[PDB]
Structure 1
């Protein structure tokens, strides 16, 4: 049922989407050991998850002071939105992973290293994504079906994941956070452009759907960065990802709070994973 719009507008999920759905995806608490020691994450599996099918996968990072349990906690309840959207056909079934930048030497800035070496192989060896194997080659070969996003300091994580992991990830959802690399918006945009240049990828092979609230403090630093990125040839600004690859959704009145930011995921996640997808769909 999903069709791309070229300038999608903010729309909260209905209030009923915040209550439990009978078609509930399973959430699995996992523990693994990597370069930052023994750590945990949650894996949301869609209702009807079949390991003999292949699922898109979206990794989603919490904000400062939060943890791997926050996004599926009572303070956010993102799983209820996921369950309802998948059941109603708004969102194709996917795996959603909530890891953490806490623990050991890990930070919001450096998490991408653990993401590459430990998180992707742990999760994607266990669960059925488009990765046929979890060697670097297997991960890279399935990059069009892998996304990363996050809120606030997790938005910063997302930008560092983008710059350092274009080989592994095609879709990016930075929420209420900017990219801290640079002394001007142009430095930030140029770093992203250089990463794209180095990757060799075409403009049809990476996608950025950024979002924040018009009353969210992070807008102050995101907006200049977004404007500098718009000026790059590397980005074609539109939410219609059949035609371009870059959008910035600004929710009127919304403040720096998961209560709003969960709706940005509701609005944006349905836009992901249709370019070079393996099903025959018309969006």
Structure 2
């Protein structure tokens, strides 16, 4: 079945000569959840045909530079196309949200702190009440958990795990690349979104995947702790480490490379 690569080969995370890659279009929309105008990038597949329907991956940034964050390295645009060429991924639509979606009147400046993190926690409502309906009503998409993936980096990865397990009925594929502390209680001090024994779902993700560099200076051993908790709870998932990598694009690209090989039935 799947052969997990601890490191992403350069050929897949970089744009190859003579290959066409998809492009991002920035969408401005209104959110009834934040009561503000917001933005997201939508990346349609090459040769997008409105007479076909496509599965969707939502890819969540961490504390970086909002919806453009995951375009800073070419792995996001390159990996799905490069796999597709070898028959190793499905055609898909990629959405890059602005994940910081605080309730009205509660926005604070970015801080590695639970108060700022509340706006990431609220993204569950932005995704389900605003962005998913936006995508269904503006693009030719396949709906349902078998056609819906959610992945992210750092605070975006914590948020992907949280939404992926709390709403596994909507999300079939969950990818967490170096997830941040605080889904569960841990030591600043995180009181936890949920208890360790609560970190599970009544319906399993089709694929759940977590990676981390072995030298991550920002989230440390918290991804491994999530691996350990999910194991204790028999929530099957893929866990792997990226040798020598820090909180960086080597860890992210290895995560996205392995994740996209699994999404939407690509392994058959």
| TM-score range normalised by the length of the shorter chain | 0.7 to 0.9
2-structure distance, mates of 1:84, 1:206: 23
Contact 2:175-2:255 within 8 A present in 1 as well:
no
* Gap change, CA 1:282 and 1:226, over 3 Å in 2: closer
User: How large is the RMSD of aligned CA atoms in angstroms?
Assistant: 2.5
The answer on 1:11 being equivalent to 2:23 is no
The answer on 1:191 being equivalent to 2:189 is no
Residue 100 (structure 2) aligns with: 102
Name structure 2 gaps, 5 residues minimum: 108-118
The answer on 1:161 being equivalent to 2:163 is yes
Normalised to the residue count of structure 1, the TM-score between the two structures is 0.77
Q: Deviations over 1:18-40 (max 9, x none)?
A: 23663221322111111112101
Residue 261 (structure 1) aligns with: 252
2-structure distance, mates of 1:83, 1:77: 10
* Gap change, CA 1:81 and 1:221, over 3 Å in 2: same
The answer on 1:27 being equivalent to 2:24 is yes
Contact 1:179-1:188 within 8 A present in 2 as well:
no
* Gap change, CA 1:207 and 1:103, over 3 Å in 2: closer
* Gap change, CA 1:228 and 1:94, over 3 Å in 2: same
The answer on 1:119 being equivalent to 2:131 is yes
1:184, distance to aligned residue in structure 2 (A)? 5.4
1:85, distance to aligned residue in structure 2 (A)? 2.5
The answer on 1:128 being equivalent to 2:125 is no
2-structure distance, mates of 1:70, 1:181: 22
1-structure distance, mates of 2:21, 2:74: 16
Equivalenced residues, count: 245
2:262 to 263, 271, 276: 271
